[PDB]
Amino acid sequence: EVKPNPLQDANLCSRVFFWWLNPLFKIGHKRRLEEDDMYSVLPEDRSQHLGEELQGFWDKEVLRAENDAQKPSLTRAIIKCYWKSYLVLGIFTLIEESAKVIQPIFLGKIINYFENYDPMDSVALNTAYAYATVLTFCTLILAILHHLYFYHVQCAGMRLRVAMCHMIYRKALRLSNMAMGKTTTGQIVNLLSNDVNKFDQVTVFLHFLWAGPLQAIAVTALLWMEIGISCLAGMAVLIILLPLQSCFGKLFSSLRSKTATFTDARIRTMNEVITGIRIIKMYAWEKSFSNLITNLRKKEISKILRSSCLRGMNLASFFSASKIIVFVTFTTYVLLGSVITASRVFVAVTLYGAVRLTVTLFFPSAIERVSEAIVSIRRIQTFLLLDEISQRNKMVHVQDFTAFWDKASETPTLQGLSFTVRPGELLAVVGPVGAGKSSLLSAVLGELAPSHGLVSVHGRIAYVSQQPWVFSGTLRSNILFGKKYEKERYEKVIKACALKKDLQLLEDGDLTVIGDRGTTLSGGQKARVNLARAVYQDADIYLLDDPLSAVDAEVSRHLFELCICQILHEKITILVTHQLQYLKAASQILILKDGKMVQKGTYTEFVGFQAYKNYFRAGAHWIVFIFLILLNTAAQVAYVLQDWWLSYWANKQSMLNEKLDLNWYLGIYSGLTVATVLFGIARSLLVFYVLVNSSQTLHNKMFESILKAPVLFFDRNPIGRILNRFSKDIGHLDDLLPLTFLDFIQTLLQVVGVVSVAVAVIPWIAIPLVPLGIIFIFLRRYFLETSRDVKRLESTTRSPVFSHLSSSLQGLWTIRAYKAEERCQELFDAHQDLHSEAWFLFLTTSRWFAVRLDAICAMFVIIVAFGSLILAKTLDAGQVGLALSYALTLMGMFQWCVRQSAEVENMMISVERVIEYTDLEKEAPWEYQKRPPPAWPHEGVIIFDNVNFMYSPGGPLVLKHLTALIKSQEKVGIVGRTGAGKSSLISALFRLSEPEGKIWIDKILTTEIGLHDLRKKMSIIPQEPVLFTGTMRKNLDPFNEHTDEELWNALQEVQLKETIEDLPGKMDTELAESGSNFSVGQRQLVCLARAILRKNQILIIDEATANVDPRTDELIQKKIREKFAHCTVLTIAHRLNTIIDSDKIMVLDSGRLKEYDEPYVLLQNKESLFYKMVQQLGKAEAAALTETAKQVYFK
Ligand SMILES: CC(C)CCC[C@@H](C)[C@H]1CC[C@H]2[C@@H]3CC=C4C[C@@H](OC(=O)CCC(=O)O)CC[C@]4(C)[C@H]3CC[C@]12C
Ligand SMILES: CC(C)CCC[C@@H](C)[C@H]1CC[C@H]2[C@@H]3CC=C4C[C@@H](OC(=O)CCC(=O)O)CC[C@]4(C)[C@H]3CC[C@]12C
Ligand SMILES: CC(C)CCC[C@@H](C)[C@H]1CC[C@H]2[C@@H]3CC=C4C[C@@H](OC(=O)CCC(=O)O)CC[C@]4(C)[C@H]3CC[C@]12C
Ligand SMILES: CC(C)CCC[C@@H](C)[C@H]1CC[C@H]2[C@@H]3CC=C4C[C@@H](OC(=O)CCC(=O)O)CC[C@]4(C)[C@H]3CC[C@]12C
Ligand SMILES: CC(C)CCC[C@@H](C)[C@H]1CC[C@H]2[C@@H]3CC=C4C[C@@H](O)CC[C@]4(C)[C@H]3CC[C@]12C
Ligand SMILES: CC(C)CCC[C@@H](C)[C@H]1CC[C@H]2[C@@H]3CC=C4C[C@@H](O)CC[C@]4(C)[C@H]3CC[C@]12C
């Protein structure tokens, strides 16, 4: 075996305790686990086996259904396959759910030992140990045997998930090209990614659909025997708790849905502000986007906070419902005139405890998961019933062939087509873009069926598609593509077809792994790989669609002459080509246009304590956390005292011969119930408020740091990386961490309550509770080191299986051409059961911890049950009833506590990422105490005095010693090769990084004044304009400093007025994302309007119109000269015609101011590097440039 699996050889006890898995933890404690450490899946769990199995039942179901004249039901097929195995796990559900019910009955019988206690009855003591021992076996069933069962019901979901994944991939290969229109590739991946994933969860609780209500009937029958008619008072609260949970849960969903719209609006604006952060800074618009996020955040956080009250009250109801259920029972019980006894009390408390979880959690969750599983099942059935290609389909022959991609009143896509080619004949296909193009080849493949006329083909086909598709796998396999390896032929297609030219190097040999997994090849390599695949498949019919666009022309001749011609001289070849050498080499040419055959013939016709402290001490003062701790402990103290009082009341009743003052005992009992409920909600709401206020503050600080972060930070960090902290990390802080943190500390205090009643009742239990505490701490670490690794392995192995369907579904015509559907299926199965073994580790690692984590819980129950009974003369029925009623509760709480403490830790990593972006470095303050006057650029003189510029501290000097004077209103051109420093001069002038040296503007040193004092008072037209979402008004003036008349006038000057007046909102017309409603040229017209509106005396133009069509270029250039004649203008240009008439040109080379003079005085020096750059144009317009400069300076 490749990776032996110990579960095949495991003894019954070995797999009950998951003892077979211990060596994995030995390894993962020492090393990081890798995919080679995973155990291979069991043979019955292979994706091939599971998917092939379910196809049999689904095939029969489709056959059965049509014989019955009915719709197929995939739910019937799924049941037919799995029902016989999954009902056998129902036997243990009956055994386990009756152990939940029989614990309370034997609890009562051990308590009856204390109620009737006399120390001399040795027979009674022995009988009490029998009840304690049966209570232990019931406890061990719930603790030890539950987990082997729970592993099996989880495998039943994996087997359904893996079988369905195989089925839908097998179908995905078979989809008709019409069905590939009705469905997006992203939707079919969504089946694998989201819908089939529902089947893991459905089988966890599917047995509670029957075991849930059946247990309620059993518990109510026993409560009637225990408590009589008064049991309906508690069961009413249990049952009525179901509609309230569901109804208020639906209300929570409405707020959840209304929150997301503000979240997405915020994140979209975040995407815009981060991507545009460099131009936003140069405009000094951070205050605009600051308000916009602040408003979107206040709306979002209000509904987050309001939604958190429902989740706070949901947890508060789950906490305190146990108190109300037993209150209304025992209030009714005693008012009806039955006295409180300790045995009948704590049997009832335990019976309500047993059934509350099934009624209020497992049964409604079973319904919810089965509801949305059936959604997925029918959703996938719609896909499984999509249309398919005719399932079974040397010459290829075509006459009158007429076909449609879809039937329409339009022209056919291909019509009248008539050609026929014999062994060795080659046809070139020629036409404009969209003329018919690849569709003729698609017709030979049979991807278009004949609607009229006929085609036929005999022998095998090879197909080098226009898109160079390659599957994720070894290059060797990409060439073999499901045909067997042969040394001679494979070496022939790599030696004689000299792939070695670009494969002996930069590829690590031919065993390199191609595709989405990595090593991603350029398109030219894939085309040769696809052609080499075609040569290796060595087909009789041979279709080339576009090898030649991908490879270079030098490779093209080698590729065509030495292989396509010499090897395929007898093979029936069709070649779509634009390289005329191959057109002439063809035996015939087919010319087509818009699906019409124009001409046919031969060419001869022509996380430590610091993170928790900084998370907590960010939304509440430490005085609140003192009061918050008091609410938490008071909630749990009152929770336990509500049960202690009932044992005290039972003890006080026990000594009467007279009656108890029922007003007083029932009155305090009602006060304790009110206390635990009111402290329950108060605790839960204050936690949620403090932690949601913590995310409010951490966001405000994080966002504030991002706007004031220097541009260097945005260059080092990708746009997606910064966005993820605003999308995902703060997402956790807003709506999942405060829930998990409350649920943790809510349950944590429940565990402390359970173990402190036991120590308070039996103080000796604290001695065997220190070994258990130490064991659990080591166990948790010893687990977590391996658990985090298999969690990482599992998450990493998913993306291959989704990626394989995505790329395979993109390559359907290639896959079907070679008939490699079996080979591509096996590749999916290999990826599907690489994950299935990572998921197998996920299931069994979790259950290895849980069985041990429940072993210490069951050990605690045994110590209490037997220590209460060894020390029986010390205790009394109320104390023993209390301590045992609680010990039995530990099982489900302590495992959940530990399963909500790693989620807290795994989410606090997002908090430290949010805190990381809170302490970013800041650029200089936007406004220093020294400020310019309201009229500061009075002359617009700019002086660079020995200016040095670096983009990074300690980076290479990009500007060197640059020293230049720019006179008032002077127009300065900046020219240079790429990297000469043109754009770096702007970054120095706007102080996007701090320049070394001094930049003076109007005698004011630009490094003394604030960044908004400097950046507002200079206008820039960038090369790549950004239009933000929102109104045209907000894109022209987000501060409303200008009147609508001024805005319309500026829009008229840039000729946008008519276009914008035609918009249905005029100035309040909402622009689409990035201004996609406008062309790139139009976007710069908006920027020119921005510059015109600001009326700054300094305008900087950075290669702006080089992205722009000549007519709009002429418009922008004309308007700049007209409107900014009185301004100092710095124009960086690539087209010298646009600046040849400047007053001066700064010439940059390699970051140095090589020349700075009047353009003609430059060109009058024939040795100037301006003159060289002009002569490098190679065009007579260089003379016109020289004359154009000369004619300026006489004036
Ligand atoms: C004493 C014991 C044996 C009683 C057994 C209980 C059954 C009589 C009932 C109780 C809960 C019912 C289930 C409750 C909810 C659902 C989900 C529901 O599915 C949906 O509503 C979503 C799919 C759709 O209907 O479109 C209908 C089936 C099912 C499994 C019901 C099937 C029949 C169940 C198991
Ligand atoms: C931090 C805030 C929420 C205060 C929490 C304090 C509690 C931990 C303390 C305060 C008063 C204590 C109680 C004071 C009095 C009693 C009565 C006492 O009952 C008797 O002594 C008579 C019956 C018997 O013989 O035990 C049992 C302990 C108990 C409940 C104590 C349990 C612990 C309590 C609730
Ligand atoms: C609400 C929480 C956070 C505060 C913790 C203490 C309380 C829950 C109080 C409420 C009722 C109190 C009990 C009420 C009555 C008694 C009986 C009392 O014994 C008597 O016989 C009193 C006779 C009398 O003086 O009238 C001893 C204290 C005790 C257990 C009190 C202990 C403290 C209790 C449980
Ligand atoms: C005397 C015992 C029973 C303890 C009392 C505890 C109080 C101090 C707790 C109980 C409920 C808590 C409140 C629960 C709800 C809110 C509303 C919350 O405001 C909103 O959620 C508004 C949302 C919106 O604007 O839509 C701010 C915290 C606050 C006042 C909490 C502050 C602390 C309160 C008042
Ligand atoms: C398998 C199901 C029922 C859950 C597990 C409960 C099993 C372990 C329980 C259910 C009923 C129990 C029996 C009920 C009563 C008695 C009498 C007493 O002197 C103890 C032993 C004996 C004979 C019990 C043995 C254990 C027992 C069979
Ligand atoms: C909430 C956390 C932080 C601390 C645990 C507080 C609660 C659970 C603890 C604190 C003091 C404990 C009480 C101390 C003494 C007694 C008397 C005993 O004869 C029965 C139990 C009883 C009544 C205990 C019940 C549990 C108790 C109230």
Side-chain angles (χ1 to χ4, degrees):
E1 292 187 325
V2 186
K3 317 176 199 173
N5 193 323
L7 182 57
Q8 291 188 38
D9 323 319
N11 179 32
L12 180 61
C13 288
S14 180
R15 46 198 188 85
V16 160
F17 289 102
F18 296 78
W19 198 265
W20 60 264
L21 189 57
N22 284 1
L24 186 79
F25 290 94
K26 299 291 176 70
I27 294 159
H29 172 61
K30 295 182 300 103
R31 296 197 284 102
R32 197 182 90 149
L33 298 182
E34 303 303 340
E35 294 174 2
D36 293 342
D37 299 316
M38 306 195 294
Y39 306 128
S40 63
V41 293
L42 306 180
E44 64 263 35
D45 296 340
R46 286 182 176 193
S47 184
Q48 171 79 42
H49 176 83
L50 292 174
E52 178 186 316
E53 179 171 69
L54 188 57
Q55 269 290 342
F57 283 99
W58 172 239
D59 278 340
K60 282 188 174 186
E61 172 58 2
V62 172
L63 181 69
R64 190 289 305 171
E66 75 173 48
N67 292 348
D68 205 5
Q70 292 187 343
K71 298 178 184 289
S73 177
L74 182 62
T75 312
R76 195 198 316 282
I78 284 168
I79 291 164
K80 284 264 190 166
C81 186
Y82 296 113
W83 78 274
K84 187 173 291 286
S85 180
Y86 193 74
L87 294 182
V88 178
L89 308 176
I91 300 170
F92 191 85
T93 311
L94 186 69
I95 288 162
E96 192 203 321
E97 291 282 87
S98 58
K100 289 201 179 80
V101 175
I102 289 161
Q103 275 184 322
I105 304 310
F106 283 103
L107 172 65
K109 294 179 185 295
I110 180 175
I111 300 162
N112 287 343
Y113 176 61
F114 296 95
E115 300 271 22
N116 305 129
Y117 186 77
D118 281 309
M120 305 308 297
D121 290 355
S122 58
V123 178
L125 180 58
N126 290 345
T127 307
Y129 281 123
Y131 304 145
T133 298
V134 169
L135 176 60
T136 294
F137 294 166
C138 300
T139 301
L140 290 184
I141 289 162
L142 297 169
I144 302 309
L145 304 185
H146 172 72
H147 295 293
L148 184 57
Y149 155 82
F150 203 89
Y151 162 68
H152 284 166
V153 302
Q154 286 188 125
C155 285
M158 181 206 74
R159 283 193 270 270
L160 177 60
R161 189 197 75 234
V162 170
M164 291 307 310
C165 287
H166 177 109
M167 291 232 292
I168 72 172
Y169 182 91
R170 184 181 177 277
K171 182 72 183 198
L173 295 186
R174 294 172 64 121
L175 293 175
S176 168
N177 299 306
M178 282 294 291
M180 289 293 293
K182 293 172 59 170
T183 57
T184 315
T185 292
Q187 291 168 304
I188 302 165
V189 173
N190 264 269
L191 300 173
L192 293 179
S193 185
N194 296 85
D195 298 311
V196 184
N197 213 344
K198 303 308 185 171
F199 303 150
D200 290 334
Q201 300 201 122
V202 67
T203 59
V204 176
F205 296 127
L206 185 68
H207 284 296
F208 288 102
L209 294 190
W210 66 265
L214 182 59
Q215 185 180 84
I217 291 161
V219 170
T220 305
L222 290 166
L223 278 168
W224 198 288
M225 300 175 194
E226 205 69 19
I227 291 299
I229 177 64
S230 185
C231 70
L232 296 186
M235 284 291 169
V237 177
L238 272 160
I239 289 165
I240 288 164
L241 189 60
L242 273 165
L244 259 67
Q245 177 180 175
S246 304
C247 287
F248 281 114
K250 279 199 173 61
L251 163 46
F252 162 69
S253 298
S254 166
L255 274 161
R256 183 66 272 188
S257 80
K258 290 195 295 180
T259 299
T261 187
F262 298 110
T263 300
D264 296 348
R266 185 177 57 71
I267 295 164
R268 284 188 285 103
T269 307
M270 286 294 189
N271 205 343
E272 291 168 55
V273 69
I274 294 163
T275 301
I277 190 61
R278 295 175 198 77
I279 187 57
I280 290 170
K281 280 177 182 301
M282 291 185 283
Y283 285 138
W285 279 357
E286 290 117 314
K287 297 187 187 186
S288 173
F289 294 83
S290 182
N291 292 348
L292 218 178
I293 292 299
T294 297
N295 294 342
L296 273 45
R297 184 56 170 177
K298 281 177 183 286
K299 290 187 290 192
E300 187 199 31
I301 205 66
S302 300
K303 289 179 172 69
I304 289 160
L305 188 59
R306 196 179 300 176
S307 186
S308 297
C309 291
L310 285 150
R311 286 193 294 181
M313 292 194 73
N314 183 44
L315 287 182
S317 84
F318 186 84
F319 171 66
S320 67
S322 51
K323 307 286 92 190
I324 301 161
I325 292 157
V326 308
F327 176 70
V328 304
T329 301
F330 284 109
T331 298
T332 303
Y333 182 66
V334 193
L335 291 179
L336 290 175
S338 192
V339 306
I340 289 289
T341 68
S343 59
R344 293 184 184 278
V345 166
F346 287 112
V347 176
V349 174
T350 304
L351 281 170
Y352 290 121
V355 73
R356 190 185 89 260
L357 274 289
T358 48
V359 168
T360 76
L361 187 76
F362 307 136
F363 184 69
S365 186
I367 291 164
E368 176 188 61
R369 290 174 182 192
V370 173
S371 299
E372 75 185 56
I374 292 163
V375 169
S376 288
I377 290 168
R378 73 167 63 111
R379 185 177 289 160
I380 296 156
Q381 175 175 326
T382 74
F383 177 75
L384 258 48
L385 298 177
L386 286 173
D387 188 34
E388 299 184 17
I389 300 94
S390 307
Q391 293 77 214
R392 296 300 305 165
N393 302 104
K394 306 181 196 300
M395 171 64 76
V396 63
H397 168 78
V398 176
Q399 283 194 353
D400 208 13
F401 168 82
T402 303
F404 296 88
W405 283 325
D406 51 357
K407 188 67 63 69
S409 59
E410 303 182 13
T411 181
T413 189
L414 188 52
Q415 66 173 133
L417 179 69
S418 301
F419 74 85
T420 290
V421 283
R422 306 153 194 78
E425 300 192 302
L426 189 152
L427 259 48
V429 177
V430 174
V433 173
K437 204 71 155 69
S438 62
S439 191
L440 186 155
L441 310 180
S442 309
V444 173
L445 290 174
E447 302 296 341
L448 288 87
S451 73
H452 181 262
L454 179 145
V455 310
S456 66
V457 62
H458 304 87
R460 294 167 58 258
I461 303 160
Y463 171 62
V464 182
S465 192
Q466 177 186 274
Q467 308 314 119
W469 173 89
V470 181
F471 67 65
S472 40
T474 62
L475 184 149
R476 188 178 188 100
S477 299
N478 301 140
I479 294 177
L480 297 173
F481 211 78
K483 195 169 67 165
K484 294 181 182 180
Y485 175 74
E486 301 298 343
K487 167 79 63 163
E488 314 91 15
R489 184 185 265 97
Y490 183 80
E491 291 297 342
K492 189 73 72 174
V493 309
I494 73 171
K495 286 177 160 58
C497 185
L499 293 202
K500 63 174 181 171
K501 290 293 190 177
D502 296 324
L503 181 147
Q504 70 194 327
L505 84 172
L506 297 150
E507 303 303 341
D508 294 327
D510 69 314
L511 293 167
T512 202
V513 179
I514 312 293
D516 301 350
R517 303 298 90 240
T519 80
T520 51
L521 266 54
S522 69
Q525 287 280 66
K526 293 190 188 180
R528 277 184 285 168
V529 168
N530 290 3
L531 181 62
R533 171 171 52 249
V535 183
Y536 190 83
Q537 287 282 333
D538 210 358
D540 307 304
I541 287 62
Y542 211 104
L543 308 181
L544 298 314
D545 193 10
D546 194 0
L548 289 315
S549 183
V551 301
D552 299 338
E554 178 173 29
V555 178
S556 301
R557 287 190 64 191
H558 164 70
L559 175 148
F560 187 73
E561 297 177 13
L562 304 180
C563 182
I564 292 171
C565 301
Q566 185 166 7
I567 301 180
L568 313 175
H569 72 305
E570 289 290 346
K571 296 168 190 167
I572 305 188
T573 302
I574 310 180
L575 168 59
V576 172
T577 182
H578 293 285
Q579 293 194 19
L580 302 181
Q581 298 181 4
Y582 317 156
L583 174 155
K584 292 177 179 180
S587 182
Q588 313 180 12
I589 302 161
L590 291 172
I591 307 184
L592 49 67
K593 174 60 182 152
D594 304 352
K596 300 180 180 183
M597 178 171 65
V598 177
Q599 176 168 0
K600 176 188 176 197
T602 307
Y603 184 68
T604 195
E605 200 280 321
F606 290 80
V607 179
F609 190 75
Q610 188 61 252
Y612 291 102
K613 188 177 71 66
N614 290 339
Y615 183 47
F616 293 163
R617 278 51 180 209
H621 196 60
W622 66 283
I623 293 298
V624 168
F625 272 94
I626 281 294
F627 174 63
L628 174 55
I629 279 162
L630 287 171
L631 282 181
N632 274 277
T633 186
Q636 186 58 217
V637 169
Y639 183 100
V640 178
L641 292 172
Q642 196 255 14
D643 286 333
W644 169 74
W645 183 256
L646 214 57
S647 83
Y648 175 74
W649 185 356
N651 293 344
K652 293 302 295 281
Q653 177 59 229
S654 190
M655 340 192 289
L656 302 187
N657 290 359
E658 69 187 338
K659 292 184 184 289
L660 300 183
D661 185 5
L662 182 59
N663 311 278
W664 188 74
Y665 284 93
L666 192 60
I668 290 158
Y669 187 47
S670 56
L672 284 165
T673 307
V674 171
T676 177
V677 174
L678 294 185
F679 290 126
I681 71 175
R683 175 257 286 281
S684 303
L685 298 174
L686 189 65
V687 174
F688 259 109
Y689 167 71
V690 161
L691 298 184
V692 170
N693 191 252
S694 177
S695 84
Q696 188 180 2
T697 305
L698 285 176
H699 174 276
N700 292 353
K701 287 177 98 77
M702 155 151 64
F703 175 54
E704 173 71 354
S705 303
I706 285 287
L707 288 181
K708 289 176 174 172
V711 169
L712 174 62
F713 168 84
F714 297 97
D715 283 353
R716 294 186 70 77
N717 292 273
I719 297 329
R721 193 201 296 208
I722 303 165
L723 206 47
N724 193 264
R725 281 161 177 75
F726 291 107
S727 176
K728 186 172 181 278
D729 293 338
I730 205 78
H732 291 174
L733 276 75
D734 287 338
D735 72 32
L736 186 62
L737 183 55
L739 176 69
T740 308
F741 231 122
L742 175 58
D743 195 353
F744 172 55
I745 70 194
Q746 174 169 304
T747 312
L748 176 70
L749 264 60
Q750 303 259 62
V751 177
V752 178
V754 169
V755 315
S756 59
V757 295
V759 177
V761 170
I762 307 103
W764 153 88
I765 295 189
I767 303 175
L769 210 67
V770 178
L772 294 174
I774 278 175
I775 284 304
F776 162 72
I777 291 296
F778 294 168
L779 179 71
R780 191 189 183 273
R781 283 197 291 251
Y782 183 55
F783 175 67
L784 257 288
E785 290 171 340
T786 296
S787 180
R788 291 186 299 99
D789 273 348
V790 308
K791 258 74 169 187
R792 180 262 302 154
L793 288 169
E794 190 275 311
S795 306
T796 297
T797 50
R798 284 202 305 257
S799 52
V801 59
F802 308 156
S803 161
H804 189 68
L805 189 145
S806 185
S807 60
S808 179
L809 191 54
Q810 187 176 22
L812 283 183
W813 299 353
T814 318
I815 293 170
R816 290 197 289 243
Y818 301 111
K819 211 183 301 293
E821 296 164 75
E822 183 175 287
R823 172 57 183 167
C824 297
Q825 178 62 67
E826 289 182 348
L827 288 173
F828 185 81
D829 289 319
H831 296 179
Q832 183 58 84
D833 60 42
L834 173 67
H835 174 256
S836 307
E837 53 191 56
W839 187 260
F840 169 77
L841 288 196
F842 185 107
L843 297 188
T844 56
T845 290
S846 306
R847 300 268 68 81
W848 173 100
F849 186 47
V851 61
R852 279 153 184 69
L853 189 61
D854 291 7
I856 78 177
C857 293
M859 195 51 209
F860 177 81
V861 173
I862 292 162
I863 284 172
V864 172
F866 282 83
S868 295
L869 190 55
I870 291 160
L871 305 172
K873 70 179 181 179
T874 300
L875 306 185
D876 203 352
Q879 300 182 36
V880 178
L882 181 69
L884 273 172
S885 177
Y886 275 74
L888 271 47
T889 302
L890 192 58
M891 193 72 74
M893 299 197 313
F894 185 58
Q895 194 192 130
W896 183 242
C897 183
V898 179
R899 254 208 296 257
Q900 275 266 315
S901 164
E903 291 176 35
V904 170
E905 280 186 290
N906 294 343
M907 271 176 279
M908 287 293 301
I909 77 188
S910 75
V911 180
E912 67 168 24
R913 287 196 298 250
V914 165
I915 290 171
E916 180 190 32
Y917 277 30
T918 294
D919 68 28
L920 302 177
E921 66 175 316
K922 313 305 187 299
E923 62 178 358
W926 294 345
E927 302 181 51
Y928 274 112
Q929 295 186 347
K930 185 183 298 291
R931 193 186 298 266
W936 160 52
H938 44 70
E939 299 182 46
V941 173
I942 309 175
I943 317 184
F944 297 94
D945 177 25
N946 196 30
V947 175
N948 284 336
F949 182 83
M950 297 176 285
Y951 284 105
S952 63
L957 282 156
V958 184
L959 299 178
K960 298 160 185 169
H961 313 113
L962 192 151
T963 304
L965 168 66
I966 297 96
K967 290 187 175 182
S968 184
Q969 320 189 2
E970 194 163 34
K971 318 304 172 192
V972 174
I974 296 152
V975 294
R977 291 173 64 199
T978 309
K982 305 180 297 174
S983 313
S984 309
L985 186 63
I986 306 183
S987 304
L989 187 59
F990 281 91
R991 291 174 57 209
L992 300 183
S993 184
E994 296 287 17
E996 288 183 357
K998 295 181 183 173
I999 303 178
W1000 304 83
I1001 295 183
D1002 293 49
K1003 318 209 134 181
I1004 276 212
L1005 174 55
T1006 60
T1007 56
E1008 295 188 329
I1009 62 160
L1011 295 178
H1012 285 184
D1013 283 345
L1014 168 67
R1015 296 177 182 163
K1016 285 186 175 187
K1017 276 301 203 33
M1018 301 185 299
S1019 289
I1020 188 169
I1021 303 174
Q1023 182 161 26
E1024 295 182 45
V1026 185
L1027 312 187
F1028 306 103
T1029 60
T1031 61
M1032 265 304 310
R1033 186 194 303 265
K1034 285 183 179 179
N1035 270 269
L1036 289 165
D1037 179 12
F1039 297 116
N1040 301 327
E1041 289 177 4
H1042 297 291
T1043 66
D1044 288 14
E1045 297 182 358
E1046 289 169 325
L1047 300 180
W1048 277 119
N1049 287 337
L1051 287 178
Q1052 188 167 339
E1053 289 293 355
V1054 306
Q1055 305 187 356
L1056 285 177
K1057 174 170 180 188
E1058 295 172 1
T1059 301
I1060 288 162
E1061 181 152 33
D1062 291 340
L1063 296 169
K1066 302 191 178 195
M1067 294 302 276
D1068 299 316
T1069 302
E1070 294 192 340
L1071 303 183
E1073 291 178 18
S1074 303
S1076 67
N1077 60 278
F1078 284 160
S1079 71
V1080 178
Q1082 287 165 345
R1083 299 172 213 168
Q1084 289 201 6
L1085 292 170
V1086 177
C1087 297
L1088 181 62
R1090 294 172 182 159
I1092 286 165
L1093 284 167
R1094 289 184 176 216
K1095 302 179 184 171
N1096 284 321
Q1097 197 158 46
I1098 295 164
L1099 177 68
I1100 297 152
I1101 301 155
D1102 192 15
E1103 299 197 354
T1105 69
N1107 276 329
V1108 181
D1109 60 88
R1111 183 183 177 184
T1112 312
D1113 184 6
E1114 286 177 10
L1115 169 61
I1116 288 166
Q1117 287 292 337
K1118 181 177 178 178
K1119 284 289 170 190
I1120 288 162
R1121 293 160 198 221
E1122 286 176 4
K1123 295 301 183 179
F1124 302 87
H1126 61 277
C1127 305
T1128 300
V1129 185
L1130 289 165
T1131 305
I1132 292 153
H1134 191 279
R1135 297 179 185 167
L1136 306 183
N1137 305 76
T1138 62
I1139 50 158
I1140 188 62
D1141 48 15
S1142 298
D1143 296 317
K1144 294 188 179 182
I1145 284 171
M1146 291 173 69
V1147 181
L1148 302 186
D1149 180 7
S1150 305
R1152 293 188 178 284
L1153 182 60
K1154 291 298 188 174
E1155 308 188 42
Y1156 177 42
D1157 218 337
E1158 308 183 332
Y1160 188 72
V1161 180
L1162 298 177
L1163 295 180
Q1164 186 59 30
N1165 180 14
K1166 300 185 184 178
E1167 308 193 328
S1168 63
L1169 178 67
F1170 193 49
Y1171 182 89
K1172 291 175 179 182
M1173 287 184 179
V1174 164
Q1175 290 293 344
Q1176 283 168 7
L1177 294 171
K1179 196 183 186 188
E1181 294 195 294
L1185 286 174
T1186 307
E1187 184 63 22
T1188 298
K1190 196 174 184 180
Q1191 290 186 15
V1192 179
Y1193 310 106
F1194 305 121
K1195 300 186 182 183

